Amino acid sequence: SLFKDDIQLNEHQVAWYSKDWTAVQSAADSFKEKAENEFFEIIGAINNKTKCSIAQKDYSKFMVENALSQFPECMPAVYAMNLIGSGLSDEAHFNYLMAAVPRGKRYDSTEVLIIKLLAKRYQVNTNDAINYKSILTKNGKLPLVLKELKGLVTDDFLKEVTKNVKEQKQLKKLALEW
Amino acid sequence: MKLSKDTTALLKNFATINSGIMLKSGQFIMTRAVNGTTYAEANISDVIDFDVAIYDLNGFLGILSLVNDDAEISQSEDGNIKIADARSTIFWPAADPSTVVAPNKPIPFPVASAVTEIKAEDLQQLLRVSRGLQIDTIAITVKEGKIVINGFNKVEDSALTRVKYSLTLGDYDGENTFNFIINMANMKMQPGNYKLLLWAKGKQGAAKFEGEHANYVVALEADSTHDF
Amino acid sequence: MKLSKDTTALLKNFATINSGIMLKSGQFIMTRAVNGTTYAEANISDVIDFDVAIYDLNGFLGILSLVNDDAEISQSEDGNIKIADARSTIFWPAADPSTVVAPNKPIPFPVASAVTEIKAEDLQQLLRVSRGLQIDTIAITVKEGKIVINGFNKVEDSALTRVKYSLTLGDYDGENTFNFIINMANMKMQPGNYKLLLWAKGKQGAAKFEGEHANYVVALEADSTHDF
Amino acid sequence: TVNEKEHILEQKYRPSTIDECILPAFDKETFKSITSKGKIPHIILHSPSPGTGKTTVAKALCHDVNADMMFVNGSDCKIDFVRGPLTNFASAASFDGRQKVIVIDEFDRSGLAESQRHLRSFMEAYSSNCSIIITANNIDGIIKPLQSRCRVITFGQPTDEDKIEMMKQMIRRLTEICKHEGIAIADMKVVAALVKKNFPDFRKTIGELDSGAIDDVLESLKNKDVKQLRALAPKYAADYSWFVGKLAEEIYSRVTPQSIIRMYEIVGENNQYHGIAANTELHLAYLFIQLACE
Amino acid sequence: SMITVNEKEHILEQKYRPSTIDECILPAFDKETFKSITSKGKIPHIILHSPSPGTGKTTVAKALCHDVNADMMFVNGSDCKIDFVRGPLTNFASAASFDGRQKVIVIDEFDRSGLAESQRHLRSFMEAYSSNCSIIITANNIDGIIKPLQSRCRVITFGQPTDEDKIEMMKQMIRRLTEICKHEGIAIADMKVVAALVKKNFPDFRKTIGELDSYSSKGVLDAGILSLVTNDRGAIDDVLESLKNKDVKQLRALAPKYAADYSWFVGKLAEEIYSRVTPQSIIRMYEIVGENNQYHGIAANTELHLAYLFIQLACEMQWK
Amino acid sequence: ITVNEKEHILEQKYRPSTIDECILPAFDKETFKSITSKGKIPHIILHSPSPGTGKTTVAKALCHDVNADMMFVNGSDCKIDFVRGPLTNFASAASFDGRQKVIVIDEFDRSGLAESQRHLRSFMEAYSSNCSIIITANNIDGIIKPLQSRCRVITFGQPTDEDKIEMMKQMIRRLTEICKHEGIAIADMKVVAALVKKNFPDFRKTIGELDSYSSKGVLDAIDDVLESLKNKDVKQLRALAPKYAADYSWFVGKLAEEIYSRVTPQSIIRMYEIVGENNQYHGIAANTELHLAYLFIQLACEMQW
Amino acid sequence: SMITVNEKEHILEQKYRPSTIDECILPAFDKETFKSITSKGKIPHIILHSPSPGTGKTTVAKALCHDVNADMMFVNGSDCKIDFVRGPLTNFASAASFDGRQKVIVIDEFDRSGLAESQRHLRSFMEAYSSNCSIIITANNIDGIIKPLQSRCRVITFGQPTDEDKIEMMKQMIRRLTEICKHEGIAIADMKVVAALVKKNFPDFRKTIGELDSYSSKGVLDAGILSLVTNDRGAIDDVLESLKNKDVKQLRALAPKYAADYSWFVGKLAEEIYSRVTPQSIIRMYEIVGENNQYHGIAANTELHLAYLFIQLACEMQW
DNA sequence: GGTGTCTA
DNA sequence: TAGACACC
Numbered sequence A: 001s002l003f004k005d006d007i008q009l010n011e012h013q014v015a016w017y018s019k020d021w022t023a024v025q026s027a028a029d030s031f032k033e034k035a036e037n038e039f040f041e042i043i044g045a046i047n048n049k050t051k052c053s054i055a056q057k058d059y060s061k062f063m064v065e066n067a068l069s070q071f072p073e074c075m076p077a078v079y080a081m082n083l084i085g086s087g088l089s090d091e092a093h094f095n096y097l098m099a100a101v102p103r104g105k106r107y108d109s110t111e112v113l114i115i116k117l118l119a120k121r122y123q124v125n126t127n128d129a130i131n132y133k134s135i136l137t138k139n140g141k142l143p144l145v146l147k148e149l150k151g152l153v154t155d156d157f158l159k160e161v162t163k164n165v166k167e168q169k170q171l172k173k174l175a176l177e178w
Numbered sequence B, C: 001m002k003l004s005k006d007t008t009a010l011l012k013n014f015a016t017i018n019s020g021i022m023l024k025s026g027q028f029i030m031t032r033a034v035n036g037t038t039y040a041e042a043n044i045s046d047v048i049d050f051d052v053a054i055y056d057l058n059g060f061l062g063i064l065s066l067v068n069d070d071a072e073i074s075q076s077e078d079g080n081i082k083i084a085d086a087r088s089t090i091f092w093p094a095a096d097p098s099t100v101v102a103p104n105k106p107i108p109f110p111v112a113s114a115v116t117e118i119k120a121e122d123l124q125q126l127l128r129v130s131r132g133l134q135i136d137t138i139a140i141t142v143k144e145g146k147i148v149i150n151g152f153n154k155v156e157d158s159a160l161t162r163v164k165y166s167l168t169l170g171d172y173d174g175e176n177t178f179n180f181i182i183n184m185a186n187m188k189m190q191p192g193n194y195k196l197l198l199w200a201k202g203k204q205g206a207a208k209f210e211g212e213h214a215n216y217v218v219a220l221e222a223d224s225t226h227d228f
Numbered sequence D: 001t002v003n004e005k006e007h008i009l010e011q012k013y014r015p016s017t018i019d020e021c022i023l024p025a026f027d028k029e030t031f032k033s034i035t036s037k038g039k040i041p042h043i044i045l046h047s048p049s050p051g052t053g054k055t056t057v058a059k060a061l062c063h064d065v066n067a068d069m070m071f072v073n074g075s076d077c078k079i080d081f082v083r084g085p086l087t088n089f090a091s092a093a094s095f096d097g098r099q100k101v102i103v104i105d106e107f108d109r110s111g112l113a114e115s116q117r118h119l120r121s122f123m124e125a126y127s128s129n130c131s132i133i134i135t136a137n138n139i140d141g142i143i144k145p146l147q148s149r150c151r152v153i154t155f156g157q158p159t160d161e162d163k164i165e166m167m168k169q170m171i172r173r174l175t176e177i178c179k180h181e182g183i184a185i186a187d188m189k190v191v192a193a194l195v196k197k198n199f200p201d202f203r204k205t206i207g208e209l210d211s212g213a214i215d216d217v218l219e220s221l222k223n224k225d226v227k228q229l230r231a232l233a234p235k236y237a238a239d240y241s242w243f244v245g246k247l248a249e250e251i252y253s254r255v256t257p258q259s260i261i262r263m264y265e266i267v268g269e270n271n272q273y274h275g276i277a278a279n280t281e282l283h284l285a286y287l288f289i290q291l292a293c294e
Numbered sequence E: 001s002m003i004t005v006n007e008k009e010h011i012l013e014q015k016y017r018p019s020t021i022d023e024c025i026l027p028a029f030d031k032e033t034f035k036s037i038t039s040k041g042k043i044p045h046i047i048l049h050s051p052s053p054g055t056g057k058t059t060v061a062k063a064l065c066h067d068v069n070a071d072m073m074f075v076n077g078s079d080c081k082i083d084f085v086r087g088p089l090t091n092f093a094s095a096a097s098f099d100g101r102q103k104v105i106v107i108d109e110f111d112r113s114g115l116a117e118s119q120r121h122l123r124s125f126m127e128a129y130s131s132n133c134s135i136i137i138t139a140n141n142i143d144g145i146i147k148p149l150q151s152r153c154r155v156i157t158f159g160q161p162t163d164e165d166k167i168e169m170m171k172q173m174i175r176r177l178t179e180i181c182k183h184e185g186i187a188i189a190d191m192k193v194v195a196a197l198v199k200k201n202f203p204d205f206r207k208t209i210g211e212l213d214s215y216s217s218k219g220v221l222d223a224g225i226l227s228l229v230t231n232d233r234g235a236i237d238d239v240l241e242s243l244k245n246k247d248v249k250q251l252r253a254l255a256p257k258y259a260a261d262y263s264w265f266v267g268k269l270a271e272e273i274y275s276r277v278t279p280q281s282i283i284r285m286y287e288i289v290g291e292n293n294q295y296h297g298i299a300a301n302t303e304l305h306l307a308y309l310f311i312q313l314a315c316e317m318q319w320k
Numbered sequence F: 001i002t003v004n005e006k007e008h009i010l011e012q013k014y015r016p017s018t019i020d021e022c023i024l025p026a027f028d029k030e031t032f033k034s035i036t037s038k039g040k041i042p043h044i045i046l047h048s049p050s051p052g053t054g055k056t057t058v059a060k061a062l063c064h065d066v067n068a069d070m071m072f073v074n075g076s077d078c079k080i081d082f083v084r085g086p087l088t089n090f091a092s093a094a095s096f097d098g099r100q101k102v103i104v105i106d107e108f109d110r111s112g113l114a115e116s117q118r119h120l121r122s123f124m125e126a127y128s129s130n131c132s133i134i135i136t137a138n139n140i141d142g143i144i145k146p147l148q149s150r151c152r153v154i155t156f157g158q159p160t161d162e163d164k165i166e167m168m169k170q171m172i173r174r175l176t177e178i179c180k181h182e183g184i185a186i187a188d189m190k191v192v193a194a195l196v197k198k199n200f201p202d203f204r205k206t207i208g209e210l211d212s213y214s215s216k217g218v219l220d221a222i223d224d225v226l227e228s229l230k231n232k233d234v235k236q237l238r239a240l241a242p243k244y245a246a247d248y249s250w251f252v253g254k255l256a257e258e259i260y261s262r263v264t265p266q267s268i269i270r271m272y273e274i275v276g277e278n279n280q281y282h283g284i285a286a287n288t289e290l291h292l293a294y295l296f297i298q299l300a301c302e303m304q305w
Numbered sequence G: 001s002m003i004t005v006n007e008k009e010h011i012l013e014q015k016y017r018p019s020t021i022d023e024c025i026l027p028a029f030d031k032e033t034f035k036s037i038t039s040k041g042k043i044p045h046i047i048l049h050s051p052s053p054g055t056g057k058t059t060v061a062k063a064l065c066h067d068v069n070a071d072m073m074f075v076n077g078s079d080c081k082i083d084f085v086r087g088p089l090t091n092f093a094s095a096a097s098f099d100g101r102q103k104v105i106v107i108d109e110f111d112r113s114g115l116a117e118s119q120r121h122l123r124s125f126m127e128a129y130s131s132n133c134s135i136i137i138t139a140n141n142i143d144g145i146i147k148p149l150q151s152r153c154r155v156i157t158f159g160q161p162t163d164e165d166k167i168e169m170m171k172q173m174i175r176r177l178t179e180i181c182k183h184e185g186i187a188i189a190d191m192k193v194v195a196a197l198v199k200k201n202f203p204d205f206r207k208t209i210g211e212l213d214s215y216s217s218k219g220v221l222d223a224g225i226l227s228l229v230t231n232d233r234g235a236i237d238d239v240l241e242s243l244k245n246k247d248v249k250q251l252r253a254l255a256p257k258y259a260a261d262y263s264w265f266v267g268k269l270a271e272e273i274y275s276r277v278t279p280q281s282i283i284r285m286y287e288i289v290g291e292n293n294q295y296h297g298i299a300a301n302t303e304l305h306l307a308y309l310f311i312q313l314a315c316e317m318q319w
Numbered sequence H: 001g002g003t004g005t006c007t008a
Numbered sequence I: 001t002a003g004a005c006a007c008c
């Protein structure tokens, strides 16, 4: 591009050939299945009783547990996995549910910022800090405190919130609508 | 405003005490470690002409050194910092004051309990040796009619029994015993010569190093003993 | 005792062979890698006046370089090491001999099987090139009536078939084939010129580099082969 | 005393000193007793009834001793956080030579178990400079060797005398802030009907002005529906120990004699296994269905 | 005269920490077994484990070193991650006792779960330098120390004295509390309140000196406070009577009363229900109470869990 | 029959060199000649799953038979750093002459390797024109879905009764020739076909046992617990418990793993309640050795398979 | 004398560490299998694994080397991260010795979980120079060593002797403890206290010499000290007898006696009730005790929780 | 989830 | 400095 009649060179060639590894690294990353699609992929197997394995997959004991608890027919097994579920292999806790719940069919970040924000300013727990968001959003509407306390957003502070570009998106969001 | 090579020298040092700084129009700069264990203050030859908080002071100073000395720092149209060079213009962010830690006021230092001095190359040996011997705490105390500094490695020696290093500052006139313990982590002073002013009232204590360029007050540790 | 800049030069080198050292009163110092694969010995100009084991020899040497040259090392009152400067005193720990690996005695080197020499700048090229080509093993062997060194990368070439580097030391008079393999990781000699004495009896083998400042014996790997 | 800038009444009116707090007889005197010595030992302040404002008493004892005070949300006190900030704080002698006091609020959060054990050697480590004040809803969440280095002080059972006198204190205080905040007093039985409505929890009653009944659940169990129950469960996850008590209490009267024998097996068994159960919110859901059925 | 006052300390359970092994209040054998160690001058690898806090573990560790004039490295066990063991602890075990002082590493509160790896690394390390340097480990829960490590150590176990030893320690602790009051300007009105402290929380001699500090608020001490101290540990009659009457209102109300000490109460209960009930109901009263006791500490609300016991008992207990 | 001399283990030293010398089922053998004739090798994943069938052996030989320039890399070894440096180096580093470049990546189904897998799927888009990839797997699910796209995955195993008959024969005849070079003696020829039967699938397993027995230069694991639970006895279980007291967290993991396959579907739901409850209460339990005994009995009672 | 003394050591379980393979107390076969090795002079790759500490693993490793006049590199297995294996261990396996001494690397306590990669790196490295240098691994838990490694080694497993072997070892250990007392100036009043130490903690010969150090406080083993050794792991007879008699008064009273160490007691109990009771009652005694043990530490009152066990047992146990 | 360790 | 792995 600046050489007209170049050949083709897909995303992957350009990466690997030039040796910037962030593109290669991102080139690897793009191929992998979307987290949300995996979480859906799994829940349906237990349910509709179809094949799949994990360990090729991201697994939240919570998610399956929660998502499952939805149908009162599942609830007995969700319980056992609840009391007992600790220290079972993510893989085991998978196979319990599999041969356990018989039939089938099936059908915060931003707030965390606000909250861990509020507790740090007033030196209080994450418990009142919920009640503090409440007492404001209703009353006083609290963009007005979101105004004083936009002040402390420091870059270091973002890392305790979340681990990714999702954080610097927030950086601005709160520099914004108040 | 413009900043001389001496001022930025000073400022880089303060940056080691605290990553940010709050600069206020006048000829006086000061900072304190976030943890309040070390405080620095200096008069400067340049005049700071506007209030500004800088979040990464080390980064700011690096940029400065990339411009001519005549480069004119001013307040930006939108409020941030504007470094203006002959042909070039740089923009550095002003920080919300509520995000950067500053001392309230310069509290006068109490008249000294003890007074001595430390020579520039002795303070250097102490710092340097300190990384090598792994001396993480030092004690300004009295031995044989002289003021000495004793280094100890507190991880390996809890009581400060085994003395890895000793430096002799000068003879001591008074009759008082004082064992003033300091945390190496808090000796941030830029290299040079320092009047050393020790002060204590009961469990309270502080040491003020008074140099040509600046002053440093630094807290003495809990274990400190004395009859002052 | 006092240590000249040459002795500490040497000592820093030995420190690369083994992290500690056992120093004995006399003009002779020696060390051996913990794994016994490389041994060094040197006569020094300074006289060591007391037996002492040093656990981190690199650390010790760093400290030394922070004092004047006249700094007088002696045995500490409690036995550790005392480095005494004009105005300052440093204390470094003596180590329990049972924790530091030392060679037993200097075993005489067997009369050489083969003798050659290696020039200071050739030894340097070999070491330097070695990091760049990734040559982790070398072979002193015979080709076309001359003693050559051949480097190989043993991870990518198991047999030592593909030769990445070759250096020609000198012609070879005898009729014997010998392929003497050395592990790059064991060439620790300080840069300089070395008489090179190769020796082998059956599966046994060792190479002694004999320099002006010191000697180094270093094991030939099990895959070395010969006619001796 | 006001902090005339701050944005929240409980925060703007927080009693600065130890008298200005609304408390039990035996309790105020015990606390006076402590600050009297001018130096604070290691303390566990434990509730368990909420909104009695543990962290307020604490923030107070520190003020009466004129101590430099580091605050930590208990949720936030993690192993490494204790290793640097606290140790950074705990270690240094203060230029002004007050006592450093670490207040750790609500230390009965969960995986903090390990930071608790790190602290056993610590507390003995800096005794002169420092003390810790732990704030717990349930003591059994403070590990026993920590309980041992600490004064355990355990809050309040207002005497009937306390009751009335506290009550007058809560009216003349609440009166005073509606003053400063320029809010209108239309009736003086509406003030005192707040001081009564939620009594031991004043922090609560002031949070009402800055704008429970188990009925919602009791009603959903009768209706035997899931959507409502499933939703109500996470609401009470917070204090299960309290809620489960209130539940057995009101279901006992409202249900058949045969169902009383069963409601106890169900709730007893559930209560019994809480703390084993991974997800407490779900474990509560499991109770609700079980109950609506039987 | 004798008692050790650190005097840089206000906190008082620590102002009064014993500096030597004699000043230590311990079982007869463990005291001699420690006296034995200090005489020889060379300390073996020891584990001192409670579990219950307050028994003298970390005091005895420091004392053993004092008494031997050891060169001691005191160390927070939580801070011994493996790198710390490889670096500073190794750098120390290895270094050459010169002052001619035996080197001891005291690793305090070393019973953490995830220090398992630092622990495995010590098992080689403890043998390698056993010539030069010995290790004293302090722990509340010994299972958190790996077997290979217990095996390398003499395991002395605190806080389970023989009744004969238990008695002698409670005599010496009382005597101590006295000598401590003397120096703190605390007046002792009744001596009964001082022995009640010693008995009330016995194994633990920290809380024991802790409660005393607590009460000198208006210093000296009276008998009036004695009623504060002893409390009421008597009469199960109210409950025993309500279980016969098989009613709920009474039981429901009595439960929160005893929530405080369940471990004590449940013991007293099984004791007196055993005699007052039928033989067949004895086999059942044990299943019921045993099962209940067993699950206390799992149970969220202890007050309710106690309620659940009472009903269960009124139902199945049948008796005159 | 080919010998790589200077090799220690017979399984390394006798390594069928050609897709012909490999002992294989009907379709499987025809399949690889099918491939070796076209003189070029596509992107492949051979997966077994039952081990010792000859994955890594067919892989290496496919290179041979086409006279490949082969780069052989084991999967545990093929790392975020290796894929970028040597692998890329070889692909883009030029061999003159004929030889075709093929990168055999062995046992690439390994837990932490999934990033090294993605990085290669992209690699394949990058370098495929100039080389070709053969990955080997015990469990294909150890492989990301996208490598299972651009790779032809051929599945080993299941010889027909005809093939069984005729493969046995080849491993028996092939066992004779090893023993001829080795100076090992065959006392009974029915005892050699006792081993070709006993573990039939497993062609790699048969050769380690053979080394074991030549001690006298002639021919004649959770298993211990898994076996004792089937036998439902106590003396054995009671004794095995203290053995594993050491790492319970590891052992209990391995146990649920292998009992899951070996037991009935209804017993799976139960084995989890039993083991889950046990694991759950470890660390409460005073005596961990006994607490483990308590598990074993509980399991022998309720498990059936 | 008849006992090696490291003599730079006060710690005494280590002052007395056997220097050779004969001085080692081991099962009959493993001693001959080790004798066999040292005679030939070239040592194979061995794993010596306990698990239970104290059985001779790291003593035997050092002895094999002594007896062969090996050139030995002793190494803390925890320190073997992969770089150390590529570096110094390779540098050593490769080197040519020359004293004509067989090279042995002893990797002590090599059973760590995360040294898994260093382990995979040895499986190539062990074959490559097996000509030159042999590796002796010591471990408490063998599953922490990868299969491919076990497979490359002779795995000799300590601490499970035959009853015939168990007897001989306890005779030799007693004999040893004696010879060690002799040299330490410890007077032996009753010999019963010395055999009680050997039996009390048997597999482990470290604690066994450790307990002995513990008891010399008064430099005598008199019957007054023999009284001590019986008590710690002592007779469960009083309870075993009360369970047969199925009475409560006795059981109720015996419970608080053993509250102290429940973890030890419950172990001794299951041990002796197993033999003395019916086969059907064995399956039950485990459910009962297992369930009890399992919930100890949840249980408020441990003394009562123990009472609850006893009744439960007297009811369901038959013999 | 937290903490630790190791390899990259 | 992360992610992989392992143990609460």
Ligand SMILES: Nc1ncnc2c1ncn2[C@@H]1O[C@H](COP(=O)(O)OP(=O)(O)O)[C@@H](O)[C@H]1O
Pocket: F010, F011, F012, F013, F014, F015, F016, F021, F022, F023, F024, F048, F050, F051, F052, F053, F054, F055, F056, F057, F058, F203, F204, F205, F207
């Ligand atoms: N199908 C086979 N034909 C011939 N030899 C085999 C076969 N399978 C395994 N072997 C023996 O095992 C060795 C390695 O086999 P490999 O193919 O790595 O086993 P796996 O199926 O687990 O990958 C070979 O050198 C060979 O002697």
Ligand SMILES: [Mg+2]
Pocket: D120, E057, E058, E108, E109, E138
């Ligand atoms: Mg302690």
Ligand SMILES: [Mg+2]
Pocket: F056, F106, F107
């Ligand atoms: Mg293979």
Ligand SMILES: [Mg+2]
Pocket: G057, G058, G108, G109, G138
């Ligand atoms: Mg060992």
